Amino acid sequence: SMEMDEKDFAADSWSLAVDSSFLQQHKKEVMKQQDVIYELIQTELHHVRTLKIMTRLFRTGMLEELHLEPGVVQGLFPCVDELSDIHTRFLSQLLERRRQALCPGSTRNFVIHRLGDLLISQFSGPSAEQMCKTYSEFCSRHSKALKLYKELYARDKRFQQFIRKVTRPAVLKRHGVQECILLVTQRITKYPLLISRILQHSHGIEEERQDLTTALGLVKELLSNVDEGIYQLEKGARLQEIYN
Amino acid sequence: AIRKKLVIVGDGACGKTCLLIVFSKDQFPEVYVPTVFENYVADIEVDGKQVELALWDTAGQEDYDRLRPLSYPDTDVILMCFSIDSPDSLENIPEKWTPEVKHFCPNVPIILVGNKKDLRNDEHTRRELAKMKQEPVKPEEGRDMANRIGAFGYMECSAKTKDGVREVFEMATRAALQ
Numbered sequence: 175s176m177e178m179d180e181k182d183f184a185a186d187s188w189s190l191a192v193d194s195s196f197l198q199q200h201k202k203e204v205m206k207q208q209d210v211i212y213e214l215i216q217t218e219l220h221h222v223r224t225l226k227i228m229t230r231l232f233r234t235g236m237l238e239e240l241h242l243e244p245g246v247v248q249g250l251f252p253c254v255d256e257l258s259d260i261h262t263r264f265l266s267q268l269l270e271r272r273r274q275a276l277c278p279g280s281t282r283n284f285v286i287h288r289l290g291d292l293l294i295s296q297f298s299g300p301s302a303e304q305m306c307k308t309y310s311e312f313c314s315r316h317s318k319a320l321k322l323y324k325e326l327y328a329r330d331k332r333f334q335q336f337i338r339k340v341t342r343p344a345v346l347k348r349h350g351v352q353e354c355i356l357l358v359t360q361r362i363t364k365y366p367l368l369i370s371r372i373l374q375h376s377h378g379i380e381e382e383r384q385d386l387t388t389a390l391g392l393v394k395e396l397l398s399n400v401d402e403g404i405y406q407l408e409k410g411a412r413l414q415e416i417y418n
Numbered sequence: 419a420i421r422k423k424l425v426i427v428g429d430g431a432c433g434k435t436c437l438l439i440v441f442s443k444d445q446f447p448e449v450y451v452p453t454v455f456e457n458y459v460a461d462i463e464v465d466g467k468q469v470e471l472a473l474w475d476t477a478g479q480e481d482y483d484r485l486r487p488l489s490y491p492d493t494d495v496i497l498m499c500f501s502i503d504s505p506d507s508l509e510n511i512p513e514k515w516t517p518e519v520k521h522f523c524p525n526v527p528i529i530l531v532g533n534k535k536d537l538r539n540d541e542h543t544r545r546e547l548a549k550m551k552q553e554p555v556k557p558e559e560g561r562d563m564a565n566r567i568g569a570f571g572y573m574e575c576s577a578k579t580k581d582g583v584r585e586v587f588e589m590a591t592r593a594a595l596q
């Protein structure tokens with residue numbers, strides 16, 4: 175991620191991110207809502223950072239430094255380009271909404287009043303259909319990717335030296351090839367936990383409460399559709415095994 | 419520094435995310451208690467052995483039966499959570515979670531963790547439960563369940579007051595090493 179956005183999301187909460195003289199000007203309920211909204215953008219920035227590691231560091235690193243088929247690299251990181259474009263666009267609209275909410279003469283003090291319209295747009299229409307289709311594919315190829323990684327690491331010396339080398343810096347501690355795959359898979363289920371806690375503290379403006387109410391139903395409908403279209407793929411699974 | 423994977427399972431209101439946050443931060447979050455837990459690699463040295471313990475959560479996955487098992491591959495220790503102020507969460511342990519964990523993680527040790535032990539001696543908590551013909555989970559009830567389900571251990575902790583949290587994860591590291 176870029177240095178501008180890391181510093182903007184370095185603090186543990188919105189009440190720590192904003193200037194203490196600006197925090198003092200607000201109600202308790204507003205700070206509570208803003209802490210939960212900040213968590214959504216902070217965890218989305220980290221999710222996008224994870225996907226940029228899988229594509230720029232893992233995927234492209236293997237393509238430009240190792241001698242394995244492009245079908246092997248594809249088996250390791252399925253739909254990473256499709257996911258990275260989906261989440262970078264979602265992050266882009268979240269960060270822009272925050273920037274437009276900043277006070278004149280400030281780069282830290284902001285208050286996001288309208289979020290539901292942004293989440294309704296993301297979790298409905300063609301953007302929702304592209305997430306349903308991409309996550310159903312990713313999560314089906316999830317176990318196949320882990321076995322391919324385990325096979326490769328235990329049988330290729332150059333792949334082992336590549337992995338040990340790129341995952342050596344302390345900042346990559348939580349981001350292995352397998353932790354990245356699980357981090358992506360678990361992300362979709364984090365949205366109804368965050369949207370329900372924002373909705374819990376958004377009862378002041380009735381329009382915001384109903385928009386978040388709708389956005390939460392859109393996420394649950396999307397999650398139900400992703401889950402209903404999952405069927406684990408196995409490398410070298412016979413046709414007889416699949417119809418049994 | 420051998421790498422081991424720990425996964426925490428349980429009902430939504432059992433307090434599993436809180437436990438994982440309090441351990442990783444090592445401090446009760448003074449200003450904001452986070453909604454979600456992504457992952458964490460804990461540096462733990464139990465009994466002279468250095469182990470990196472990856473900490474995972476199934477929170478949010480409880481209703482998604484074909485999404486939840488994608489957290490189970492390569493698990494070394496399972497922490498089976500239940501709330502002490504919710505006796506119905508303990509009842510769900512042998513008939514919902516236990517068949518599922520033993521199917522996807524065969525031969526992986528399970529530690530029965532009763533969270534929120536502070537609420538066992540809480541006024542409002544005992545008062546609410548009495549209004550449904552109930553009381554908080556007693557120590558012998560948790561131990562009996564841990565035995566009945568074939569758990570490696572039964573432990574109790576309070577994520578709020580921090581009592582017993584360090585030892586759950588040092589014992590988990592030990593179970594993962596067997």
Ligand SMILES: C[C@H]1C=CN(CC2C=Nc3ccccc32)CC1
Nearest residue numbers: 206207209210447448449450451
């Ligand atoms: C241990 C402290 C942790 C949370 N505090 C309340 C708080 C501050 N920000 C928010 C946002 C949403 C919900 C609750 C809060 C009080 C106690």
